[PDB]
């Protein structure tokens, strides 16, 4: 799986990281169904489907 | 040695006295300095006077007044109990006792600095009690209408104010504990700019 | 030997030694351990001597 | 004449009552643990040198975040009318704080803030020229 | 869209609208200007005289401008409150930091989302009115309530 | 007329607004007052609240459940339960000469001085606000123990609910 | 689906107790698993008996990370 | 009139016991990073002071990585100081990164020094007009 | 489950209230708190004066005390006996000690699933009552048994 | 057969037995429907299905 | 000492005896892997384990 967000990924415990000047965040990481992000202070769940 | 009355404009200005106990009373304008180590028990004064005392070294003491009089005293005395239904001024430099009993009715204004275990604080109207510079173990208050009080309690601090009276707490203590009435208003009034002031913790938070 | 503050007026203060002795300061005196009280601060509980020192209350 | 016991609670659940049970267990383990690191450890101050209180520093507030430092700090020197300081490089692994406090003060906040960082972060305060400074710490 | 909601949790704008009239009405400022919002309540309809005892009454005027702001989403809530001149500086600024928090305390207490409640108080330092002969009666003893809405 | 928070800490009047709802027959109102204010009767008010009253030999004591009439961790008391604590001043008024006992406990979860210092402030609240309606400092002494005589096992989820309590005891003469 | 109504219905005091981050080292390792054993006694036949007082073992060696675990993989 | 308890109130015995179990081992881990963190003290703590020259209140944006000789010897030109390097620059060049939008070339400064750590120091000499760069052998 | 047993054996909490409301219409006092209940009996009822002996209707009492004692998995019942000043010291703490033997050996004659039994008398050293004009008439003169129910 | 408790065993004979910290007992011993404990000084008789 | 993994089992079952009595056939019955102690003037009662192994 690669992401591109710019917020902060908690579940799945990623492989490589990188970012921007700008702060956005990409990913590359294993296959997974769901995420967990910590967004403002808050706790969120993401849903991804298509595996 | 023991007895000592003076009334009618009478100045007495004297010093190096020493005693046991002797009992004085004094009326219409007693100018009354007395600067030895002298120790006593029981004083009265009519009213209209004024009267500065250096040197107590008593255990024992119980003064009630009924007009307006000054004193100032320098010393150390266990203070039992007092009270005040009339005009009354008080200024006190140091008491090392166990336990005090304030009663005020009419009008006063109390300046007190010690060391006490446990004291009770009766205010009805026009008085302001300071409690500046007094640190004690157990604080109870009670304030009536038009009544202004500072506490400086240590350990426990237990306090209820009727209506329209000012209570101020000069220190945290380890446990508070406060009841407004009607307008009864219970307050901090502190620096806010100490380097090394303390903050709250869990028991000691209490929520008006 | 160590001392701790029991109540301070304007101009004097009460102390009390790890020994239990006990003391009655000027704003100018001379203190063994301590020095010489350079000031009285009584509106909080700190007062400074000649050699650097700030008494507090025990807690 | 009938007969009374005082805790009437709602019905509850074996769920959590069995959490309820282990969480005991690990707050007596995590106590002795603390109880005997604190004497085998010798303590020598407290952050109070490192940061101190000021004047308009008394103004509370009650938080709870589970994320990142840097928004929280950002919202924080906001709150105090601070001018922002920011030493160090940034961690490729994010410093994730979560505190849910209730009803504290700003000065004792930061403070217990700079507690929970660890080893990768710290605060400084500079309240005559009302400078937050956090710094990362060069490790690696 | 079986699983995703249309909306955010039981919300109805008419509502808002109803409620931000019936407060109006009331007589509590409302401010909606760019995204921000300020909700200004006078102190004499929620507190005693230059005291911080909380009348009866007024727990439900405020546990309904409770649900207002929780029927929002927001982060962070700005909450002070202002009063008249009375003896010091120190009385009335002591006065209004209880009183803020206490008010913050019981909305944290009801079910409002947030993550950052900030409690301050300031007494008579920054004047609203020129106007100043009343007592606690006087409009610039007041409580304010600042924040910008998310997203 | 009434205020719900604690009357202005005022000694309350029930009897007269009894007889003007009754009068508006007054020895009917009277009578449903004596049956209405009786000592039967408030026991059992305090039967119907969640408060346990033990009446053995000359000594008389009184148990209110924490986690009920408390919000949890604190030592502020619940307003809520103001019908319960006006009936408990209304009971206390009947007793004017003998000294009271109050103490507090806690479970065992936590640590021991913490959970000694909560049972303290808890205590210490509880003498203050029956201090505030009016009885002498005299007669007074207060206690926060810790879990060290327990009538429930803590290790037990309702026996833990029983065990946190306030215990209040008094002597006859 | 009620449990799982029930687990997050308590959310918070889960992370409250289950900090993992505290419990990151200082080079964002997470620390091994170590289990201890007391009064240990084994009869393995007819004149044979072996005991010990106390025994320690090593689970799980240390190893990297890059976010901290949490209860939901866990737990949910 | 009315009024509500909180709404998320521990009304149940175990949600009670997780609560005040949560507050527990909360304070219980404040304790331990609390008698962990290793602090410096103010007095000698090593780090840049602030020089307040008059020429070293200029505000700019600069973002750049690599080696600290040639963004100081820019930097100082760009507040018209002289400059100068007492030491060896190793085999191993000293890289810092800096991304900034707005503030002074003071914490500028500061804050390579703070990046430069045990390797190299920054010394600020507003009498004759300098910067100069200290190696450690 | 049929073949489990689904309650204790012999059990009935409504007869358990309805023998515990007979028994304080009796006058025996039942006290309950948390899991340790007690039990106080005046020893006028069992005992004639000073006496080391009972009545025989004394036993149907006591049978019906055993039949609500069957009614609780327990371990350890506790038994003390206080007379009133009498004689002696020496005198009142061998009667209690009498007393509660004869208690202790009828009540472990009659089939109380138990396992321990401690009794004690301790005379007049603790009272209940400073009233103390009677005999063996007085209230505190009495025999009273612990114990605490477990799980 | 792997049992885990915290009260005693009496008929069997386990093969090997461990302690815990606070005491709870873990036994290893061989299959049997039935096993006898001992509560408080009282004895009992325990019941396993599923062999 | 310390409890031996084997566990010491002890059966009894007497009737109305004193608690010296009740302690000596305990003592009695444990026999040669434990031994009961009593310090009156210091009010305690010890029990010690076997020193074998």
């Not at chain 2, 009276?165 to 806010?192: C, H, P, Q």
């Not at chain 4, 849910?100 to 700079?114: V, W």
């Not at chain 7, 029930?6 to 990151?24: E, G």
């Amino acid at each position: 799986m690669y992401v591109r967000t710019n917020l902060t990924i908690l579940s799945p415990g990623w492989l490589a990281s990188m970012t921007s000047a700008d702060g956005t965040h990409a990913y590359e990481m294993q296959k997974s169904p769901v995420l967990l992000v910590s967004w403002h202070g808050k706790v969120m769940q993401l849903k991804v489907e298509g595996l | 040695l023991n007895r000592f009355r003076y009334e009618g404009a009478g100045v007495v200005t004297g010093n190096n006295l020493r005693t046991s106990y002797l009992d004085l009373y004094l009326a219409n304008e007693g100018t009354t300095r007395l600067a030895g180590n002298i120790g006593l028990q029981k004083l009265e004064a009519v009213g209209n006077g004024v009267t500065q005392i250096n040197g107590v070294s008593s255990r024992n003491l119980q003064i009630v007044l009924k007009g307006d009089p000054k004193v100032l005293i320098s010393g150390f005395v266990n203070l039992r109990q007092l009270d005040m239904y009339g005009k009354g001024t008080l200024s006190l430099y140091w008491i090392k006792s166990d336990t005090l009993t304030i009663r005020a009715k009419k009008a006063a204004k109390i300046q007190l600095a010690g060391i006490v275990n446990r004291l009770d604080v009766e205010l009805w109207d026009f008085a302001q009690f300071k409690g500046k510079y007094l640190r004690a173990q157990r604080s109870f208050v009670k304030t009536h209408d038009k009544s202004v009080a500072e506490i400086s309690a240590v350990n426990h601090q237990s306090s209820l104010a009727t209506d329209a009276s000012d209570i101020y707490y000069y220190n945290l203590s380890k446990t508070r504990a406060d009841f407004m009435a009607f307008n009864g208003s219970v307050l901090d009034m502190r620096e806010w700019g100490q380097s090394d002031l303390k903050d709250f913790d869990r028991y000691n938070k209490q929520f008006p | 030997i160590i001392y701790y503050i029991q109540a301070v007026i304007p101009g004097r203060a009460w102390l009390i030694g790890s020994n239990g002795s006990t003391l009655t300061v000027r704003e100018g005196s001379k203190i063994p351990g301590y020095g010489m009280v350079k000031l009285i601060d009584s509106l909080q509980g700190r007062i400074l001597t000649s050699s650097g020192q700030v008494i507090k209350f025990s807690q | 004449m009938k007969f009374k016991k005082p805790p009437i609670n709602n019905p509850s659940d074996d769920a959590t009552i069995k959490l309820a049970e282990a969480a005991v267990s690990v707050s007596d383990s995590m106590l002795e643990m603390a109880k005997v690191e604190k004497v085998i450890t010798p303590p020598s101050k407290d952050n109070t040198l490192t940061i101190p209180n000021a004047y308009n520093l008394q103004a509370r507030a009650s938080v709870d975040w589970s994320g990142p430092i840097e928004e929280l700090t950002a919202r924080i020197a906001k709150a105090a009318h601070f001018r922002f300081r920011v030493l160090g490089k940034s961690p490729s692994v994010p410093v994730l704080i979560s505190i849910s406090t209730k009803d504290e003060s700003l000065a004792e906040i930061l403070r217990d803030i700079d507690y929970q960082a660890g080893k990768k972060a710290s605060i400084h305060v500079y309240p005559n020229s009302q400078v937050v400074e956090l710094r990362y710490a060069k490790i690696y | 869209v079986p699983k995703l909601p249309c909306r955010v949790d039981g919300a109805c704008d008419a509502t808002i609208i109803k409620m931000m009239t019936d407060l109006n009405k009331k007589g509590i400022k409302v401010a909606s200007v760019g995204q921000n919002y300020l909700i200004s309540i006078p102190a004499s309809a929620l507190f005693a005289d230059q005291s911080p005892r909380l009348n009866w009454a007024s727990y439900s005027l405020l546990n309904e401008i409770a649900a207002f702001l929780k029927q929002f989403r927001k982060i962070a809530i700005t909450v002070t409150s202002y009063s008249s001149k009375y003896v010091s500086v120190k009385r009335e600024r002591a006065l209004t930091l209880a009183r803020s928090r206490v008010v913050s305390e019981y909305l944290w207490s009801q079910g409002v989302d947030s993550r950052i409640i900030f409690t301050q108080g300031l007494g008579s330092d920054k004047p609203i009115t020129s106007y100043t002969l009343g007592g606690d009666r006087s409009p610039n003893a007041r409580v304010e309530i600042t924040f910008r809405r998310a997203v | 007329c009434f205020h719900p928070p604690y009357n202005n800490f005022q000694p309350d009047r029930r009897a007269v607004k009894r007889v003007g709802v009754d009068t508006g027959g007054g020895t009917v109102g009277l009578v449903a007052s004596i049956y209405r204010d009786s000592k039967r009767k408030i026991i059992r008010d305090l039967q119907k609240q969640d408060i346990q009253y033990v009446e053995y030999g000359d000594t008389r004591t009184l148990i209110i459940p924490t986690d009920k009439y408390f919000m949890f961790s604190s030592p502020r008391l619940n307003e809520i339960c103001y019908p319960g604590l006006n009936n408990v001043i209304r009971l206390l008024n009947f007793y004017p000469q003998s000294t009271i006992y109050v103490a507090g406990f806690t479970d065992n979860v936590g640590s021991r001085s913490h959970k000694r210092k909560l049972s303290q402030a808890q205590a210490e609240t509880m003498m203050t606000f029956l201090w505030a309606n009016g009885i002498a400092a005299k007669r007074l002494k207060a206690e926060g123990y810790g879990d060290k005589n327990a009538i429930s096992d803590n290790a037990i989820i309702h026996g833990s609910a029983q065990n946190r309590r306030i215990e209040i005891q008094w002597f006859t003469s | 689906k009620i449990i799982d109504e029930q687990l997050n219905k308590q959310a918070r005091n889960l992370d409250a107790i289950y900090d993992f981050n505290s419990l990151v080292l200082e080079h964002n390792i997470l620390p091994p698993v170590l289990l201890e054993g007391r009064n240990t006694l084994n009869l393995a036949d007819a004149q044979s008996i072996r005991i010990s007082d106390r025994t320690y073992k090593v689970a799980k060696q240390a190893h990297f990370i890059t976010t901290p675990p949490t209860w939901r993989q866990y737990l949910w």
